[PDB]
Amino acid sequence: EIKELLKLGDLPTSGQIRLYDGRTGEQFERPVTVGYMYMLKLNHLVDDKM
């Protein structure tokens, strides 16, 4: 189902896409998988651990 939704917003079915590197402004010699993810700032930062 996900594949068939990518062809709605037009983002490659492969999920890997072309990006460019900072430092250099020079290519990445292969498509890299990218996307949106739910992460956590779970408890105990560094501030309470040092």
Binding site: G22, T24, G25, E26
Partner: protein, 227 residues
């Protein structure tokens, strides 16, 4: 061997935020050198006008709130943070915002002062509900560069600040997005060539024009130890 020197052809204004910039002619293997090098300055650096300090009557700390207001203090600090501002002459400026009644609170409700020119006259700052209350506040705007938040400002000073003077982190850097294209230039002399198109998006606090000339100055400024 003689070096071609690239120039400006046309500036394509699309909005007070967005603008492309076309550049030709650049010799082979130079669209990658500069375009990248330009961008690296254009994000990292660049002197935009932004909000730093605020005071409000009837408020003690940021973590409290004011009656007849939908949004919280930190929320209004947060809405002030992402403001758009312009300054002509002096560096540091003190604004006065006074609005009262029902409905939203847009920036155009601040006193239009001489040097002061606002980019977005329909930006969201704060909300009001009850019609027997208002909000008066002294906001402070500054020109700097990069990101000196409130945190690094609580340890390079010892004369001490008063109560009510809250601190927003400063978003001095104006630009929010940038890229660069590498297309083939058709000059009517040589066909080997390329041309550099730099897309940008911003808050309008610095013009798309100066921005480019101002950054390449900084670039060269660094190169002055090797000539």
């Amino acid at each position: 061997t003689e070096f071609l020197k690239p120039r400006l052809v046309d500036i394509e204004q699309v909005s007070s935020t967005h603008a492309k910039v076309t550049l030709e002619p650049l010799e082979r293997g130079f669209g990658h050198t500069l375009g990248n090098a330009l961008r690296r300055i254009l994000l990292s650096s660049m002197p935009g006008c932004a909000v730093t300090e605020v005071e409000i009557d009837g408020v003690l700390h940021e973590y409290s709130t004011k009656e007849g207001v939908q949004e919280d203090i930190l929320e209004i600090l947060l809405n002030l943070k992402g403001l758009a501002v312009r300054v002509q002459g002096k560096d540091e400026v003190i604004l006065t915002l006074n609005k009262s009644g029902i409905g939203p609170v847009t920036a155009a409700d601040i006193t239009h002062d001489g040097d002061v020119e606002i980019v977005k006259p329909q930006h969201v700052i704060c909300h009001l509900t009850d019609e027997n209350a208002s909000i008066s506040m002294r906001i402070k705007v500054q020109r700097g560069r990069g990101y000196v938040p409130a945190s690094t400002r609580i340890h390079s000073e010892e004369d001490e600040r008063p109560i009510g003077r809250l601190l927003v982190d400063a978003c001095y850097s104006p630009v929010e997005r940038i890229a660069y294209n590498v297309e083939a230039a058709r000059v009517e002399q040589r066909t080997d060539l390329d041309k550099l198109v730099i897309e940008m998006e911003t808050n309008g606090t610095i013009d798309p024009e100066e921005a480019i000339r101002r950054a390449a100055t900084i670039l060269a400024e660094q190169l002055e130890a090797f000539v």
